[PDB]
Design a protein around this ligand. Structure first.
Ligand SMILES: Nc1ncnc2c1ncn2[C@@H]1O[C@H](COP(=O)(O)OP(=O)(O)OP(O)(O)=S)[C@@H](O)[C@H]1O
Ligand SMILES: Nc1ncnc2c1ncn2[C@@H]1O[C@H](COP(=O)(O)OP(=O)(O)OP(O)(O)=S)[C@@H](O)[C@H]1O
Lengths: 719, 85
C-alpha cells in the first residue's frame, strides 16, 4: 500500500486490519451526512467544522471502520483513506525537487478508477500556511482550482475559531468546502460512550469501573466546567483514573509514604541528648519531648487496617471460583437448568451473604477514606470527584473530602471561633451539607446570604473562618471592597471594560479571579455603600452562574458561598440598643427581634430593590454584643494568642477579674464593642513586645492574670 | 546495531515511514553522575602516565559536581573527561 502513499502520510485501512482501531461508538447521523457529501456531482469535500472537544477526528476513523467492514453504499466500497500531514506540516520537505516531487505526485495520483485513494487532512487551516514562501504561493491556493473536479476528495476538521479566522478570510477557499456542523454530544450520549469503553479499560488496563463512577464521570464534569467540551471530559477523567489506580494499587500506597517521614526526621533529632541542661527556655524543651509520643499512632494503625482491607482481598480470591465461575460453567443452552435447587440457588445466597457483605464493606470504606482507598480495585464516585478536585483550586483536604464526619463537625467548628447567632450558622452549615451531597442546585450558587446587623459584631469574620476551615487557606477568601465600588461608573470594574475601550485584556477585577478558583467563598464587604447599578449586576450573580465576561465566557459560581455583609446598624432596629442586655428573654427578645428583622426586610424593599431580596437564601440578623456575650468572646481571643504566639513561648491565662476589668472599660455602645479589639492591642500589648525585663522574652509565659481592681494596669508576674 | 543522535533522526531517518518501525530504539540513559565517578577513577591510569602527574581521587569527585551545577550542557560525561585534561 506504500505505492499510493508515496511513503508520507498513512493509509487508514491497514491500521484497521491491525489491532489498533476498534469500533467507534455511533454518531450515526453525523457519519452518513459525510457519506452523502463525499459522493457528489461536484466539490466533493466535507469538512467537520466543530468544537475542540467534538471528537470529529475520531468520527472519521468511525467512517473508515465502516469502509472496511462494508456498512457503506456501493459507490464507496474499496477506497483507501490517506491522512496528509504526518511527516511534517509540509507533507515532505523536498530539498531535491522543490515543486515537482510533492505537489505533482499527489494530484496525478487522483487518476483513473483503480486509484481509489481518499485524502484526509487533520487541520485544513494549516494548508493556508503550507507552501508559504517568498518565491511561491500557498499550496491551498493551488488546490482551489483543483476542487472543481470529481476526482479530488477531501475530509478535514478544524475548530470553529480557526474556521472563522483562517478559512472565512479567503472567501473563495471557504466556498468549495461544505459545512457539516459537528454538534457536541448530549449528556446522556457521553454516558453511552463510556459504557462502550468498559471492555477497553477492564481488559487493556484490568481495573474494574463501577457504574456509579460512569454516571459521575460525565455529570460532574459538565456542570462544573464551561470549556473543553463534553465528550473529552467524560473520557479524560476516566483516563486519569486508569493511571491513578495503576501506580498505587499494584504497589505501596501513598499514605505509607507520608506517615513514615514525620516521626524520624524532625521529632527525633531534636529530642536527643544534646541539651539535657534545661536552663535556656525551660518551658519549651518539655514540649519537644511530648511530640514523639503521639506520632507512634501514625505507623501502627494504618498497617493493621491495610491487613484488614487485605483480608477483604483474599475473600476476593474466593468469589472468583464460586460467584463468577459457577454462573459461567453450568448455565448454558442445554436445558438451561442442570438441577437449579442444588448448587445454583445456593450460589444466589452466596451472592447475598458473601459478595454483598463484601460489597457493602467496600462501599463503607469509600466514605471512610474518600480518596486513595487502600486495597480497593473498583473505581468509585468519590474517587471520580477527587480527580476533579485535583484540577480545581482545592487543597488535598478541607472538609469537602471529609464527608459525613467533617460536614457535621463543621457546625461544631464554627461554634468554636464564632459564638453568637447559631441559627444563622444552622442555615450556613446546612448549605455546605447540601453541597457535600447530591442535594445540589445546578443554577443557583450554593450559600447566598445577606448579613445585616449592628456595627461591631463578627459579620465579616465568618468569611474568614470558612476560608480557613472549608478551604484551608485565606487565598479562597475573595474580598470585594465595596468602598471602591461606590460610584455608578465603578460597575465596569467588576465585569471588566467592554470591547473597543481602555483595558479589555483583563476580564475584570472580581470576574477574572473567580475563574481560576471556582471552589471559593466570595465575600462582599459592605453592600450599604454602592450605587444601585452595581446591584443590577448582582441580580444575575445570586441568581445563576450565567455570568459572562467581556469575552462572554461563563464563570462557575457553583460551589461559591456568596457572603454579603452590610451594616445598616446605625439606622434603626438593632441600632436601638438592646434595652435589656439579657442573654435571650424568650417571651421578649424572640418576639421583638423578629419585629425588627421584618422591618429590616421591609427596609430592603426601600433600597435593595426587592427583586434582589428574592435571590437571597437567608437574611440573617446578628444579635448585638453586651456583658453576657462579650464575657465569653475575649477568652477565645487570648486562645488565638495561645496558638499564634507560642513557639517563642506565650501561653496566657484569664481570670474572673481579668475579663471583668475589660468589659466595664472597653465596651462602647456607639462602636458596638469594636474597641475590645483595640483595648487588647493598646494597653496589654504594651506590656508585651518590650525589649527586656517587662516581659519574659524567650523563656516562658505561664502568666495568670489578676488585678486588685484599682483601675490601673497591674500585670502580676506569675509566669 | 547502529547509532544516531537523539535530535536528528526525527527529521531525516524517520522519513521512509516503513523503515521507522524497523528502526527500533535503545534509550541511552542520563549518566547517573555518582556512578560515573567510578569511570574517572579507572581512566586516570593513562592520564597519570601520559601527563606524568599524579591525580588526587578527592579532586575528581568534586569535578563531577562542578560539571553538574556550574555548567548545564554538553551531555555530562563528556565534561568530566575534559576537566581532567
Ligand atoms: N463516538 C466515539 N466513539 C469512540 N470514541 C470517541 C467518540 N467520540 C470521542 N471519542 C474519544 O474522544 C477522543 C476524541 O478525539 P479528538 O477530539 O478527535 O482529539 P484530536 O484528534 O486531538 O482532535 P480535537 O481534540 O477534537 S481538536 C478520542 O480519542 C476518542 O477515544
Ligand atoms: N460573634 C463573634 N465571634 C467571634 N469574634 C467576634 C464576634 N463578634 C465580634 N468579634 C470580633 O470583633 C471583631 C469583629 O469584626 P467585624 O465586626 O466583623 O468587622 P465588621 O464586620 O466590618 O464590623 P462592622 O459591624 O461592619 S463596623 C473582630 O475582631 C472579631 O474577632
Amino acid at each position: 500500500g506504500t505505492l499510493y502513499i508515496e511513503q508520507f502520510g498513512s493509509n487508514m485501512n491497514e491500521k484497521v486490519r491491525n489491532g489498533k482501531l476498534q469500533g467507534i461508538y455511533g454518531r450515526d447521523e453525523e457519519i452518513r451526512a459525510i457519506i452523502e457529501s463525499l459522493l457528489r456531482y461536484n466539490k466533493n469535500s466535507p469538512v467537520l467544522v466543530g468544537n475542540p472537544g467534538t471528537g470529529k477526528t475520531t468520527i472519521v476513523e468511525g467512517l473508515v471502520y465502516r469502509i472496511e467492514k462494508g456498512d457503506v453504499p456501493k459507490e464507496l466500497q474499496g477506497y483507501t483513506v490517506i491522512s496528509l500531514n504526518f511527516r511534517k506540516f509540509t507533507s515532505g520537505t523536498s530539498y531535491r525537487g522543490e515543486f515537482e516531487t510533492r505537489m505533482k505526485n499527489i494530484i496525478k495520483e487522483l487518476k483513473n478508477k483503480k486509484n481509489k485513494i481518499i485524502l484526509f487532512v487533520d487541520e485544513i487551516h494549516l494548508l493556508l500556511g503550507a507552501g508559504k514562501a517568498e518565491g511561491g504561493t500557498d499550496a491551498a491556493n493551488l488546490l482551489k482550482p483543483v476542487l472543481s473536479k470529481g476526482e479530488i476528495k477531501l475530509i478535514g476538521a478544524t475548530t470553529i475559531a480557526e474556521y472563522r479566522k483562517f478559512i472565512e478570510s479567503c472567501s473563495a477557499f471557504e466556498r468549495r468546502f461544505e459545512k457539516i456542523l459537528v454538534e457536541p454530544p448530549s449528556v446522556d450520549m457521553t454516558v453511552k460512550i463510556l459504557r462502550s469503553l468498559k471492555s477497553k479499560y477492564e481488559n487493556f488496563y484490568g481495573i474494574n469501573i463501577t457504574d456509579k463512577a460512569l454516571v459521575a464521570a460525565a455529570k460532574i464534569s459538565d456542570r462544573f466546567i464551561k470549556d473543553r467540551y463534553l465528550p473529552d471530559k467524560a473520557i479524560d477523567l476516566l483516563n486519569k483514573a486508569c493511571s491513578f489506580l495503576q501506580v498505587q494499587l499494584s504497589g505501596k500506597p501513598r499514605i505509607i509514604d507520608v506517615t513514615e517521614r514525620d516521626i524520624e526526621r524532625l521529632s527525633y533529632e531534636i529530642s536527643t541528648l544534646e541539651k539535657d541542661v534545661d536552663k535556656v527556655s525551660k518551658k519549651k524543651y518539655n514540649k519537644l519531648i511530648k511530640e514523639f509520643e503521639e506520632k507512634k499512632e501514625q505507623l501502627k494503625k494504618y498497617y493493621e487496617e491495610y491487613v484488614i482491607t487485605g483480608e477483604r482481598l483474599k475473600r476476593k480470591k474466593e468469589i472468583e471460583k464460586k460467584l463468577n465461575d459457577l454462573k459461567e460453567l453450568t448455565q448454558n443452552y442445554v436445558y438451561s437448568n442442570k438441577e437449579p435447587p442444588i448448587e445454583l440457588q445456593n450460589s444466589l445466597k452466596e451472592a447475598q451473604q458473601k459478595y454483598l457483605e463484601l460489597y457493602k464493606e467496600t462501599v463503607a470504606y469509600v466514605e471512610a477514606k474518600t480518596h486513595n482507598a487502600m486495597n480497593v480495585d473498583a473505581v468509585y464516585q468519590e474517587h471520580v470527584s477527587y480527580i476533579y478536585l485535583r484540577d480545581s483550586g482545592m487543597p488535598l483536604g478541607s472538609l469537602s473530602f471529609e464527608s459525613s464526619k467533617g460536614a457535621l463537625k463543621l457546625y461544631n467548628s464554627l461554634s468554636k471561633s464564632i459564638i453568637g447567632n447559631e441559627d444563622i450558622i444552622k442555615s450556613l452549615s446546612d448549605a455546605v451539607v447540601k453541597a457535600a451531597t447530591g442535594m445540589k442546585d445546578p443554577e443557583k450558587p450554593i450559600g447566598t446570604f445577606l448579613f445585616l446587623g449592628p456595627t461591631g459584631v463578627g459579620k465579616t469574620e465568618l468569611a474568614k473562618t470558612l476560608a480557613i476551615e472549608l478551604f484551608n487557606s485565606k487565598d479562597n477568601l475573595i474580598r470585594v471592597n465595596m468602598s471602591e465600588f461606590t460610584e455608578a461608573h465603578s460597575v465596569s470594574k467588576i465585569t471588566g471594560s467592554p470591547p473597543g475601550y481602555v483595558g479589555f485584556s483583563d476580564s475584570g477585577q472580581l470576574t477574572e479571579a473567580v475563574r481560576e478558583k471556582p471552589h471559593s467563598v466570595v465575600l462582599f464587604d459592605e453592600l450599604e455603600k454602592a450605587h444601585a447599578d452595581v446591584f443590577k449586576v448582582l441580580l444575575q450573580i445570586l441568581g445563576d452562574g450565567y455570568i459572562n465576561d467581556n469575552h462572554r465566557r461563563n464563570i462557575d459560581f457553583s460551589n461559591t458561598i456568596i457572603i454579603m455583609t452590610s451594616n445598616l446598624g446605625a439606622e434603626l432596629f438593632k441600632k436601638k440598643l438592646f434595652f435589656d442586655a439579657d442573654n435571650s428573654g424568650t417571651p421578649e427578645y424572640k418576639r421583638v427581634m423578629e419585629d425588627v428583622r421584618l422591618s429590616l426586610i421591609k427596609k430592603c424593599k426601600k433600597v435593595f430593590k426587592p427583586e434582589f431580596v428574592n435571590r437571597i437564601d437567608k437574611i440573617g440578623v446578628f444579635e448585638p454584643l453586651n456583658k453576657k456575650n462579650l464575657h465569653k468572646i475575649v477568652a477565645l481571643r487570648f486562645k488565638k494568642l495561645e496558638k499564634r504566639l507560642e513557639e517563642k513561648n506565650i501561653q496566657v491565662s484569664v481570670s474572673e477579674k481579668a475579663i471583668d476589668y475589660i468589659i466595664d472599660q472597653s465596651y462602647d455602645p456607639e462602636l458596638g464593642a469594636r474597641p475590645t479589639l483595640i483595648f487588647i492591642e493598646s494597653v496589654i500589648m504594651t506590656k508585651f513586645a518590650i525589649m527586656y525585663l517587662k516581659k519574659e522574652l524567650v523563656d516562658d509565659m505561664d502568666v495568670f492574670v489578676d488585678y486588685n481592681s484599682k483601675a490601673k494596669n497591674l500585670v502580676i508576674n506569675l509566669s
